[PDB]
Amino acid sequence: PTFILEPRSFLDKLSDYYYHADFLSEAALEENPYFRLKKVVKWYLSGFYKKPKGLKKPYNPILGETFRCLWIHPRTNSKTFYIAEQVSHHPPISAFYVSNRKDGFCLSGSILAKSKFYGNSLSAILEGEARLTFLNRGEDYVMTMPYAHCKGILYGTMTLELGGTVNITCQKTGYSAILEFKLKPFLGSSDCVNQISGKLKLGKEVLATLEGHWDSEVFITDKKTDNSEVFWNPTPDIKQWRLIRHTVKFEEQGDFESEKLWQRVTRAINAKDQTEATQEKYVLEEAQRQAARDRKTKNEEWSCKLFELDPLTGEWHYKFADTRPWDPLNDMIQFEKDGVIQTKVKHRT
Numbered sequence: 001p002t003f004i005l006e007p008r009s010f011l012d013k014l015s016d017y018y019y020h021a022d023f024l025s026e027a028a029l030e031e032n033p034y035f036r037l038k039k040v041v042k043w044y045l046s047g048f049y050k051k052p053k054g055l056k057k058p059y060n061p062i063l064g065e066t067f068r069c070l071w072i073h074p075r076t077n078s079k080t081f082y083i084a085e086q087v088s089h090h091p092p093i094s095a096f097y098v099s100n101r102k103d104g105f106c107l108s109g110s111i112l113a114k115s116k117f118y119g120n121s122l123s124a125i126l127e128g129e130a131r132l133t134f135l136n137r138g139e140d141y142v143m144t145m146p147y148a149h150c151k152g153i154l155y156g157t158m159t160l161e162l163g164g165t166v167n168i169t170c171q172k173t174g175y176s177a178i179l180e181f182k183l184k185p186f187l188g189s190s191d192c193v194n195q196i197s198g199k200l201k202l203g204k205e206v207l208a209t210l211e212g213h214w215d216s217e218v219f220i221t222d223k224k225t226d227n228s229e230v231f232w233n234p235t236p237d238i239k240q241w242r243l244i245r246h247t248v249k250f251e252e253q254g255d256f257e258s259e260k261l262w263q264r265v266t267r268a269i270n271a272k273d274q275t276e277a278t279q280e281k282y283v284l285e286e287a288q289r290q291a292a293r294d295r296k297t298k299n300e301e302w303s304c305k306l307f308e309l310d311p312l313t314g315e316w317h318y319k320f321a322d323t324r325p326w327d328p329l330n331d332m333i334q335f336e337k338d339g340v341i342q343t344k345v346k347h348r349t
Contacts, residue, residue: 001153002278003055007266009258010058011067011084011094014111017047018098019242021071021080025103028134033173034207037200038220040132040141041168041177041210042232045196049215049234053160054152059262059281060113061086061094062288066306067258068339071243078102079334080243081341087304087316089288093128095307097318099341101326101334104136110316111145121151135325139172146181161193162214175202181214254338306339324349 006013020043027039061067063086071080080103084096091112098107109130116123125147132141144166152158163183169176179198196214199206210231212218220231253260265284268277295302307316320340327345334343 002057002281003274004057004150004153004158005269005277006056006058007262007269008058009065009067009262010061010113011065011086011096012069012258013058014084014094014096015067015069015082015245016050018071018080018082018107019050019245020046021098021100021103021105022073022075022241022243024105024132025073025076025078025100028104028136033175034200034202036134036139036173037168037170037175037177038231040170041179041198041200044143044166044168044179045214045218045232046234048162051160051162051215054158056160059258059265060089060092061258062256062261062284063087063089063292063302064256064305065258065261066254066256066339068248068336070246070336072246073100073103073243076103081334081336083306083318083336083339083341085304085306085339087307087309089292093316095304095316095318097307097321097341099322099334101135101322101324101331101343104326105132105134106321106323107132108318108321120154120156121149122153123147123149133323135323137172139170141168141170143168149183159193166198173202175200177201177210179210 023039023043023046027036027043030036030039065086067084069082073079078100080098080100082096082098084094086094093110093112095110100106107130109128111126111128114125114127126145130143132143146162146164146166149161149163161183162181164181166179167176177198177200179196182195182197184193194213194215196212196218198210200208206223208220208222210218210220217233218231219228221228247259248257250259255261261284265277265280268280306319308319310317322343330345330347332344332346336342
């Protein structure tokens with residue numbers, strides 16, 4: 001079926017996790033190593049609550065497709081930039097880069113999409129590591145993502161649950177938190193779905209533990225005081241303030257950017273025309289297959305414009321990555337132009 005389709009590219013949906021980059025600026029300033037992990041994890045859980053259940057099925061992005069967007073930080077008077085590019089359609093790998101130098105953090109990663117069909121239920125996995133770096137500290141956080149289990153395609157209630165075991169690891173300080181997304185059992189209950197449980201630990205010693213639901217309250221209890229507290233809850237006041245995202249002017253967008261590329265596919269979905277939504281998709285995929293043939297005909301060499309593969313490590317690296325800490329006497333404004341994230345400085349370095 002294809003009535004299960006969200007009018008957003010996967011590169012677009014991949015940027016949803018940074019609507020609370022407000023938190024990451026705070027974490028960069030937190031001086032206690034333990035409290036930085038708490039605030040990093042609190043940010044991680046902040047990117048799953050808007051997720052809708054059911055039809056949601058981002059577009060499989062096309063090779064060379066690019067999404068580019070921006071967020072505004074009023075309190076720190078700065079901006080968080082996001083750039084993602086589809087580097088391979090076979091395999092379906094999309095790379096992303098996030099940079100906010102004034103607030104002292106950046107993220108990089110690459111995500112491979114693999115699905116498995118159980119008949120009535122579908123499970124799409126996202127495997128890959130995201131590296132959060134605090135520029136001023138030279139301190140990295142490596143984290144993975146869960147997988148989405150979808151039941152009710154053919155018959156039964158249509159649902160989307162999150163499951164898996166995520167590891168958020170910081171080797172510099174020795175801290176880490178292991179999270180476990182728990183799927184509802186056969187019996188089920190009013191609170192069995194979206195259950196999240198985890199534990200914050202240093203080295204191997206467990207400092208504190210987490211319980212709750214990832215779309216609702218999550219509670220932390222200290223393993224030394226056994227006193228419970230609210231670790232994270234998406235309060236409507238917290239929801240009321242999600243950083244405002246700014247996309248590129250449609251007339252200024254390249255033809256292979258996500259919004260311009262999928263416009264006709266998106267319009268069909270929003271118009272509820274199911275038949276013309278599939279046809280418009282086949283136009284893009286048929287062009288991709290034809291552009292893949294044309295490539296093999298004379299020279300099969302596809303240059304990713306904004307990303308490049310490191311042969312030694314096998315990881316995808318943003319061509320224009322910059323990790324130098326913010327220098328107030330030199331750095332003036334971080335900006336982006338044509339997918340290139342830059343900073344205006346009064347001294348070249």
